[PDB]
């Protein structure tokens, strides 16, 4: 919860809302833009 990794997320929630790429809770196979458990 207080603590992520690196959201390069490019996904469509992921390049819209930056407010989570320090702490996206997405593992090494977030390649995806229908896999991605991110905040949103
Ligand atoms: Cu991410
Ligand atoms: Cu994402
Ligand atoms: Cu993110
Ligand atoms: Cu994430
Ligand atoms: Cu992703
Ligand atoms: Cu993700
Ligand atoms: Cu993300």
Same mark, same amino acid.
């Given at each position: 919860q207080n603590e992520g990794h690196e959201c390069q997320c490019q996904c469509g929630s992921c390049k819209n809302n930056? /407010? @989570? /790429?320090? *702490? =996206? *809770? @997405?593992?090494?196979? =977030?390649? *995806?833009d229908d896999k991605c458990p991110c905040g949103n």
């Open positions: 930056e /407010q @989570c /790429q320090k *702490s =996206c *809770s @997405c593992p090494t196979g =977030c390649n *995806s």
